[PDB]
C-alpha cells in the first residue's frame, strides 16, 4: 500500500509487504490513467507531467506487472510479481513539471 519515484529517471516503484522491498513496475499495459492514479497516490492531486517506458538499468529480477483481468480494483491490487516485463521497459513517471530555471534548456 504505497508508491514512489526512484532515482533521477523517476522509476515508478511499488513496495511489497511480503518481499519487504521496492520493485519497479513494468510498462506492460501501462498508460497515462495508471500514471495519474499513481500521482494522486503521491498527493499530487490533478498534477501529471509525463509517463513513458524506459529500459531498466538496475539489473532487477523482480517487477510488478498489471493483471489486465483484475477488474475494477485499485491499481495496487491489479499488480502482481513478475520476474520479467514483456515490454522490456519499466514505468518512468513525473507528476509535475519541475526543476527547470530560465537557463535550463
Amino acid at each position: 500500500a504505497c508508491v514512489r519515484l526512484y532515482g533521477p529517471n523517476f522509476i515508478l516503484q511499488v513496495y511489497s509487504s511480503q518481499r519487504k522491498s521496492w520493485h519497479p513496475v513494468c510498462q506492460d499495459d501501462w498508460n497515462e490513467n495508471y500514471g495519474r492514479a499513481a500521482c494522486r497516490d503521491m498527493g499530487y492531486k490533478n498534477n501529471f507531467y509525463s509517463s513513458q517506458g524506459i529500459v531498466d538499468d538496475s539489473g532487477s529480477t523482480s517487477f510488478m506487472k498489471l493483471n489486465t483481468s483484475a477488474g475494477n480494483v485499485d491499481i495496487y491490487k491489479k499488480l502482481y510479481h513478475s520476474d520479467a516485463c514483456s515490454s522490456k521497459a519499466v514505468v518512468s513517471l513525473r507528476c509535475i513539471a519541475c526543476g527547470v530555471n530560465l537557463n535550463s534548456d
Binding site: 504505497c2 514512489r4 519515484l5 526512484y6 532515482g7 533521477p8 529517471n9 523517476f10 494522486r40 497516490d41 503521491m42 498527493g43 499530487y44 492531486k45 498534477n47 509535475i96 513539471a97 519541475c98 526543476g99 527547470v100 530555471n101 530560465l102 537557463n103 535550463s104
Partner: protein, 241 residues
C-alpha cells in the same frame, strides 16, 4: 547568504519569501502550485498559525513585496518529530489558500527521489534574503551561492558539529567558511542539478554563526521527508486513507 552574489530573475523560480507582519522572516521552496517546503523552526509558536504568513514568489526585492502582492498561507504543518532543542526534523509545509500561477519566474523544484546517488561533495546552490554577514539584517535582494555537500561523518567531527548531525540533516558549505547561509535563509533551498533537473536536497536549518570556519550550514535532509510530504499532500482534502 554570505559570500554569494545577487540572483537574476528566474534563476531560482522556486524561491519564496515568507512574510509575517509584512516583513521577511524565512525562505521556502515551491513544490506545487499550493505547497511550499520551509523549516519547522520558522513556524514555532507564536507563529504556528497560518494566518500570520504570506508567500512572495517571482520577486527578487523585498521592498516590492508589499501587502496584496503576496499569497496568503492556509496551512502550516510542522514535521511531527521536529525537536526545537536539537533542530532535528526541521521541516514544515505551508499550503497556500490560492494556487500560484507558474510562469518564467515562478516554478517548482523537484522533490528528491531515493537513489539520487549524489557525489559526497556534490555541487549545490543556496538562495535567500538572509543576512550577508553574521547577525546582519535581511537582504533587500535575493542572493545565491555555490556550496558543496560535506559528508556527515566529516561534519560530526569534534572539530565541527560534535555528533550533532542526525540522519535527518545534511551539511553543506566549506569547512574554511566564507560562503554560507545565514539567519533569514532558513527554510529556503539547497538545490543540486542532476540529470538536467534541479532537485531540492535541503532546507536551510541551522549553523553556528555564519560563514565561520569549521561551522558549515546544516540543512533539513529533504529526501528523508519526501514520503511524509507525499502523505501530507494526499491527506489534504481526504476523507479516509
Amino acid at each position: 547568504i554570505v559570500g554569494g552574489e545577487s540572483a537574476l530573475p528566474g534563476a531560482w523560480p522556486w524561491q519564496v519569501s515568507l512574510h509575517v507582519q509584512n516583513v521577511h522572516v524565512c525562505g521556502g521552496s515551491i513544490i506545487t502550485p499550493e505547497w511550499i517546503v520551509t523549516a519547522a523552526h520558522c513556524v514555532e509558536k507564536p507563529l504556528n498559525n497560518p494566518w500570520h504568513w504570506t508567500a512572495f514568489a517571482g520577486i527578487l526585492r523585498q521592498s516590492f513585496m508589499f501587502y496584496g502582492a503576496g499569497y496568503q498561507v492556509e496551512k502550516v504543518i510542522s514535521h511531527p518529530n521536529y525537536d526545537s532543542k536539537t533542530k532535528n526534523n526541521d521541516i514544515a509545509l505551508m499550503k497556500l489558500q490560492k494556487p500560484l500561477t507558474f510562469n518564467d519566474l515562478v516554478k517548482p523544484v523537484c522533490l528528491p527521489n531515493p537513489g539520487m546517488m549524489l557525489q559526497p561533495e556534490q555541487l549545490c546552490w543556496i538562495s535567500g534574503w538572509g543576512a550577508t554577514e553574521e547577525k546582519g539584517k535581511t537582504s533587500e535582494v535575493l542572493n545565491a551561492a555555490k556550496v558543496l555537500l560535506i559528508e556527515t561523518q566529516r561534519c560530526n567531527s569534534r572539530y565541527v558539529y560534535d555528533n550533532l548531525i542526525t540522519p535527518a540533516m545534511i551539511c553543506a558549505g566549506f569547512l574554511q567558511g566564507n560562503v554560507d547561509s545565514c539567519q533569514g535563509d532558513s527554510g529556503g533551498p539547497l538545490v543540486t542539478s542532476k540529470n538536467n533537473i534541479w532537485w531540492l536536497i535541503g532546507d536551510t536549518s541551522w549553523g553556528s554563526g555564519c560563514a565561520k570556519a569549521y561551522r558549515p550550514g546544516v540543512y533539513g535532509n529533504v529526501m528523508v521527508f519526501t514520503d511524509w510530504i507525499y502523505r501530507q499532500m494526499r491527506a489534504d482534502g481526504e476523507f479516509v486513507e
